[PDB]
Design a protein around this ligand. Structure first.
Ligand code: HEC
Ligand code: HEC
Ligand SMILES: [Ca+2]
Ligand SMILES: [Ca+2]
Ligand SMILES: [Ca+2]
Ligand SMILES: [Ca+2]
Length: 278
């Protein structure tokens, strides 16, 4: 569809997967990444802070090396979209850059095209095939994911296509977006990346009672938390008028001991299941 902001808009909201994490003002509802309304002017400010040549250069860097600068208040969750699974082509990345410049600015197509030689070509990805060390399948991993007889049951906290229970985020579609490495880290190192909105808070009430958990809901009169202990979860409803302090902690309720609770087979099967969630 060429290199035009119009093409880029279709890709951002489509096969680039950008809108699965980013909203633009009142368009979209995704929150895993920052709202991109006003991004073109923000990029000019980022480039100044970072000693880059232009806002455009910051936008390019943000796609080609997402980890190089991490927006405050977010973790290293954005994938390299020119690598698997997304495998977004170079022409589509150039188009998306034109779209990003249109978010409060003016696309500069000649300037974008000069960055072509810095954008990796998806077909030339250097990522190696994911090969688990024993034979596992996605269907086997689905069984593990929902198995309530294990010492961890992913489905107690994550929904897929209407199955499971919501504590952490819904995982439907994540295999179209994320890498097996991100799945490994998410399972075994849960606090390395905290999905936005799923932070643990530490609350203290006026009566001196502590509660540490994630926020399920937050109304004008009640804060509902989900607490976790030994893989089980529990709700508590705290009257807002009784809250003395609340602080976000960079820690996850996803358990930290899954490497002790899943066999090698179960673990690699679950990864294959996650990859399959297109
Ligand atoms: C969720 C898994 C994401 C996907 C898919 C995409 N992005 Fe993203 N992006 C995400 C986060 C959490 C962050 C902030 C942390 C960081 O890496 O800096 C970003 C950031 C950006 C930025 C910078 C925004 C800023 O305010 O400075 C840009 C320009 C950006 N992301 C672009 C972008 C595009 C075009 C995507 C589709 C090809 C895309 N992102 C996907 C999370 C996620
Ligand atoms: C509730 C006590 C949980 C259990 C059991 C499991 N997960 Fe979890 N997970 C939970 C939360 C609250 C969060 C968000 C905060 C964070 O740590 O990032 C997560 C996150 C993930 C992710 C990342 C999702 C994303 O959108 O990027 C993945 C891939 C994930 N969790 C996988 C997963 C698996 C496979 C589990 C069973 C072995 C599992 N989780 C259990 C909460 C809880
Ligand atoms: Ca970044
Ligand atoms: Ca995590
Ligand atoms: Ca009140
Ligand atoms: Ca209790």
């Amino acid at each position: 569809t060429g290199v035009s902001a119009e093409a880029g808009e279709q890709i951002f909201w489509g096969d680039g997967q950008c809108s699965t994490c980013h909203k633009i003002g009142s368009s979209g509802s995704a929150t895993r990444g920052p709202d991109q309304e006003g991004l073109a002017e923000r990029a000019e400010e980022r480039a100044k802070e970072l000693g880059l040549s232009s806002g455009l250069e910051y936008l390019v860097e943000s796609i080609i090396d997402p980890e190089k600068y991490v927006v405050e208040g977010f973790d290293k969750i954005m994938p390299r979209v020119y690598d698997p699974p997304i495998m977004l082509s170079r022409e589509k990345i150039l188009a998306v850059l034109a779209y990003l410049q249109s978010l409060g600015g003016e696309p500069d197509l000649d300037a974008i095209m000069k960055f072509k030689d810095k954008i990796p070509e998806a077909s030339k990805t250097k990522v190696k095939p994911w090969v688990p060390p024993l034979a596992v399948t996605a269907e086997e991993g689905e069984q593990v994911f929902f198995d309530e007889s294990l010492d961890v049951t992913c489905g107690k906290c994550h929904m897929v296509n209407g199955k499971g229970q919501k504590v952490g985020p819904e995982l439907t579609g994540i295999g179209a977006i994320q890498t097996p490495q991100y799945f490994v880290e998410s399972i075994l190192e849960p606090s390395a990346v905290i999905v936005k909105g799923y932070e643990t808070v530490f609350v203290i009430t006026a009566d001196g009672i502590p509660y540490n958990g994630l926020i399920k809901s937050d109304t004008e009169e009640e804060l509902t938390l989900i607490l976790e202990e030994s893989g089980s979860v529990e709700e508590v409803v705290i009257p807002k008028d009784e809250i003395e302090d609340m602080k976000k902690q960079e820690v996850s309720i996803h358990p930290g001991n899954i490497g002790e609770l899943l066999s090698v087979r179960q673990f690699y099967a679950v990864i294959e299941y996650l990859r399959s969630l297109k």
